[PDB]
Amino acid sequence: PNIRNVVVVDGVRTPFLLSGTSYKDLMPHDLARAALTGLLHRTSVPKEVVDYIIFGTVIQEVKTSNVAREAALGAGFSDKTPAHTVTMACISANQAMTTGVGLIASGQCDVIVAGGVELMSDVPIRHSRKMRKLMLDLGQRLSLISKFRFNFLAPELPAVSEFSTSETMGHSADRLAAAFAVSRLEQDEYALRSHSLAKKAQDEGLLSDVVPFKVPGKDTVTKDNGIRPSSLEQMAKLKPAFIKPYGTVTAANSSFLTDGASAMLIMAEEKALAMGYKPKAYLRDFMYVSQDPKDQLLLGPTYATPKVLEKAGLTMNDIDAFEFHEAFSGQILANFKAMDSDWFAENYMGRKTKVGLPPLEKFNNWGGSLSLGHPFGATGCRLVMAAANRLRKEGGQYGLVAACAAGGQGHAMIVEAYPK
Amino acid sequence: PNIRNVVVVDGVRTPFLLSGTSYKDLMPHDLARAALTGLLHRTSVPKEVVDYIIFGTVIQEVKTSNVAREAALGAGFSDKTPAHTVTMACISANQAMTTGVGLIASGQCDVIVAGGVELMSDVPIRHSRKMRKLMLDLGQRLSLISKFRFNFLAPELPAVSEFSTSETMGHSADRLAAAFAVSRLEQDEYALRSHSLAKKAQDEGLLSDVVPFKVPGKDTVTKDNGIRPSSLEQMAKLKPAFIKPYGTVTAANSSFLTDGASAMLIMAEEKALAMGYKPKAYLRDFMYVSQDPKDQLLLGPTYATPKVLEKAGLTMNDIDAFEFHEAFSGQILANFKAMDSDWFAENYMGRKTKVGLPPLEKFNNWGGSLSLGHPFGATGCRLVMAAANRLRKEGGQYGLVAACAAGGQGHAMIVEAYPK
Amino acid sequence: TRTHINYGVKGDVAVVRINSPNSKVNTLSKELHSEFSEVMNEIWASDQIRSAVLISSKPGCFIAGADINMLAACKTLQEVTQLSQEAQRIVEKLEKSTKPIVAAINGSCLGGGLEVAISCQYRIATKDRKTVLGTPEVLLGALPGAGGTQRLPKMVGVPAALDMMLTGRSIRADRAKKMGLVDQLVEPLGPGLKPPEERTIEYLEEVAITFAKGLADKKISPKREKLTAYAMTIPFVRQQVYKKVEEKVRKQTKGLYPAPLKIIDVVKTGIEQGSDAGYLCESQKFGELVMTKESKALMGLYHGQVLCKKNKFGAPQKDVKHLAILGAGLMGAGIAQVSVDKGLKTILKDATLTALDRGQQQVFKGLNDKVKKKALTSFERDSIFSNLTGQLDYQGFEKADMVIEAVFEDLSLKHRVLKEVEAVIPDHCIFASNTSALPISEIAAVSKRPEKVIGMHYFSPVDKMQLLEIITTEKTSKDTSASAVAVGLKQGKVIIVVKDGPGFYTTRCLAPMMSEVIRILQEGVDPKKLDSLTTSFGFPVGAATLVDEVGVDVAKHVAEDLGKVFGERFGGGNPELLTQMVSKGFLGRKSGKGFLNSDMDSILASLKLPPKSEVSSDEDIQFRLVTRFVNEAVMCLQEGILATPAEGDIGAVFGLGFPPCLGGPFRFVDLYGAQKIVDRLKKYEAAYGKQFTPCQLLADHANSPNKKFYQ
């Protein structure tokens, strides 16, 4: 109760484009610079007060390592501001904010920038394990290194398979989907919702966490692209791609390869009231847990939430506004179905009942993932302002954000309303 | 004075090999596993008590991202232990310990593993910016994507050049070396020291922060390789490689491409006294600052140290044992020469005099970098135990560790003796 | 004695240093060689010292070229050839010494400095943007200070530097290694025990001395793939290179530059004839083309060129850091393209998104060609681009301190636009506008602040041309004017200050030229011929390309603007038909194709307006357009357009399109004489009697009592 508080300020997000449109020209530290300049466009903060910016990627474009250093130097920051990247699988950003709030509550620095930036358009296709031994080349020794050769030229691929179990995202996706009794019809009511709300959200136009910038190669501007509504009969015809047609995950109700960036600012409360910026939210407790990647691969959030509710000292139903992150349809309703019953908190911890009961009404109304795409390491640093401006818009004062990651890590943290 | 304390426990380091020897077979998350199993060999800790392991690379072998997750799962850890990597240029590890101590002093978790793991043997030579657009390939559209082609096959290289100024490590190295009046003879007295002490250090054999493991492809064991002593007359004949022969940095007194890993354990003090392990050191304050990469590129440590001395509230000369990290000879004596005079603290901050006076006697006696090689992102998590067991060995109680990074970031933190 | 040059002994090596504390930069002069003589002979009279090195210990440039007021110091032909024959005799002293020597370069070495540089055995240079290496020889129109062109192609080659020594343009130190003039590079330093640039000038002394001892005992040799193909191969292709260049120089320019081909005859005769005998041909040449009527006023052009790259208004108080560009398009994004790289924060106002795509694709497309020619790094490119944000409505003008309007010209809409973009701006600001026609004192009486409004008019392709012009009311404070011209010279484009008038200066003189561009095709003399006819007199772009330069839509407004006041009698004087040109709707440059177009002829044969007859040949109409242009250019300052008119055509030749190698419209009273032009229009006296009427101030001192303006 004597720990210094901590504050989210206005959360710039450059809009998410499906891959193949205007971000197929860019360079994977450039829209970092775009999102960060957009943060410095609506914050009016002197550029020397911003203390310790931290970003997070997943790809790590190796011509320029530690993205955040030169990505802050590119936007003209004063260069007495150290930086580092933080790489996880999926909640890279929203690991940025938690190490930032740890950096603040230690009581040594002033303000944090946290952001998440990636482009799955140019995936790194690297050359081979053994052709790169021709790095020994760089006058007869130059010949004798080249003397041993057969046809072993093959570019090995970064097949996103989590490597601990050697199988892609979708196998574990429809495993956990089918394991908790999810029909195809029940799995796509949510797919209908996660676009039907999204088009109305862009229609009223108050999802205003978006800066535009111009892509330097192609024509004009950007605005989000992954939003398309359809009917239920025009979805079940789509034959599923991740498994043979008995399964139940198709590309309609599933994430897609999209690119984008995000940033925010995190301030100590006392300098937030000394300088005089109007804040948005506090940033209270955070549990941070992992799951064994053989069984519960994408049972991310709902093994973590009753460990953070008891951490804060409150109850489930008296939260005011969730937003759970998705990566597949059905996954989130399996993260509805499993904990609206017994037997699963049973035998995977001791003696609780129904500690997940989300009433579905106070759920993802401003459409979360599957609405405007799922960047692979930049979600989360959308999600906090999509909690904050949301629970300011209606009443209520608390709300948890929780996300699942490729590898078993979960994330869950509660966010409180504006201090006025 | 009511902040919870924090403790370094025994710091395993797998030995550093010059590249081309037995680590040219490995896989860049494997000696992570070796160093971590070696940490679990001499700590006797139950494998379920270790809470939140964090590593740090610089290369990010992209077939398996977030190294620490599967690199903890590989050593048989209980998988209810979340993990992430932290990538900087050079002080990646020793950014690991500071985010760990921030994680502890927040007061939510128990114990931290911090380590740094890399192999510059297989550098990532990636394919091209535009051939990877043939990812669109993965029956006439398969032809029409292949229809546009000229000879533009060229593997672009990860030329380590820091990208903010488009020039390698050595240009800035001998610039800062020549700028502070360093002769060739004065630059290599230190080169003689940093091997002459090292061979005696391995001769007495008390540098005992080394586990062996077997390389699976090649024959037997490992032990450090970069140690060779010579005379001063057998060094000036080596013609310098980083610049035309008027310059003053050659490959003899300079870092070399070497590979290796390191880990440690960081404990809260109260559980360190409750379980009963004999600690090594406390881990007090840490300043963390950057420098503008046009002028002071490798003026890393000595712009950071008088910002941490006043942070802790003590004085320079009454420290007991330094160890400054090196990356080039001369650099460290330019980080002796500049601040043993005026005019440089002048005009780059306000009103100090001679706040760096290291008396050279309490310096790098157990040979630091250039002795047993400089891994590119794993130094530092050697350096803390090389401070700790060192200042236990003689008297004294305090000592600062400070390191410079490729990009302008510095690092400096004080380490106190054993609490008994 | 030792007034500017000195050495000492260290390492038993003579460190001769170059300095001149009087001026800011050091110049080659008689007053420098008068002591530079009796030092190297003492170096040649020594024996302990076995190597020497010269350097400019003053920071900045290395030396200048020919000192501007010494070659322009008027002297007779035998002495100007005697000095320019003596000036290389001192170079043929030291270029082949027994005791070898080393020079060094840490500045903008230009002009005769290469004479000092490449005469040496071994030079050494500093890789940064400030050091450039160029030969300003043809740009003032001469041959160099000691005739180094007879050992440049001995060194680097005929075809290699033949596109160097008469292209005029300089080279940075990076390409000079691949060229081969300087061989070794050394990058500068940052922080030192001494301030961070004084060591870099004292760093080269020791790199020079560690080269120097090696030269005495020969551990390194001075014998340092396209030129190697040429390197021995010219027995027969001789005419088949300089003939290709002979028509190259007259296809690039036109043949009425007698300057640059007169350095070709040097390198034409330097090959195949007596090389040492060739060092006296230019003694019979340098005295010719300096004492001629081609480049005599070109020295005065250079005096004004350096003279208006100066602040000239006191001291800059409260310098600007932010900008505010009201309106995208071709000027706004245009002036953003130049005002963004060298450290000015800018905000670019637009109306809708639909024109920012046409906006930033100038400030990007005209930028990365800059990195396509390797003049910048690939990284700093993008920070330069990200200094420019583009807003949509207003959020951020509270931080702004200087505003420039860029909206398409109107008296009515901008009258309001200044009234709604006044409130969200602080009081220590500057409002300014790039009007072309209507004056500012008509719109300076509207706003809340009367005194913080100036004008800045640009010119249309903003990158290539290189000047601004200032519009100064009655109410402009000295601080306002100084703060404006601070942006002017920090911009880099050479400024001129103008006290205003109805029609200020440049369109004020351009429309009385443009109103007779219809007059040649008013008879119908196939104005495709007129392009050759007017580029023959010297204008770099034809008058058809001038009306395709201005934009056809503003042509009616710049016809009506002073025709509202006095353009009908002498700001013009022909029937306007451009409204009939746009009656069909021709679009000018945005229609792509210019004028045969098959529809200009129907204009003149609408009703028979040209039965006209007068003896007006091509030379006649050339001097008609030029003499009316200079009648207007001498009309200025008769009302006092500014303080002293020697500041004049530093503007009016340098963006207006007036030919260099013609001294300027204010400079034809001198080498062509007011007497001769008044005989030209007195030959033209009975034509109309109305429009060509000469001014009174130039005419009274014109012919008889040998008076000039200031000379």
Task: Give your account of this protein's structure.
The PDB classes it as lyase,hydrolase/transferase. Keywords: lyase, HYDROLASE-TRANSFERASE complex. Structure of human mitochondrial trifunctional protein, tetramer. This is part of a larger assembly, with 2 copies of chain A (420 residues) and 1 copy of chain C (711 residues). The radius of gyration of chain A is 22 Å and the shape is globular. Chain A starts with 5 loop residues before the first strand and ends with a strand. Chain A has helices at 30-39, 67-73, 96-105, 141-147, 169-179, 186-204, 269-275, 305-312, 331-337, 383-393; strands at residues 6-9, 17-18, 52-55, 84-87, 111-118, 258-263, 265-268, 281-282, 286-287, 323-324, 398-404, 410-416. The longest helix of chain A is centred in the middle third of the chain and has 19 residues, at 186-204. In chain A, helix 1 packs across helix 2 (67-73). Chain A has 420 residues and is α+β, with helices and mostly antiparallel strands. Chain C has 711 residues and is α/β, with parallel strands linked by helices. Chain C has 31 helices and 18 strands. The radius of gyration of chain C is 29 Å and the shape is globular. In chain C, strands 1, 2, 3, 4 and 5 form a 5-stranded mixed beta sheet that branches. In chain C, strands 13-12-11-14-15 form a 5-stranded parallel beta sheet, with helices on one face. Chain C has a 3-stranded mixed beta sheet with strand order 6-8-9, with no helix packed on it. The interface between A and B is large, with 59 and 58 residues.
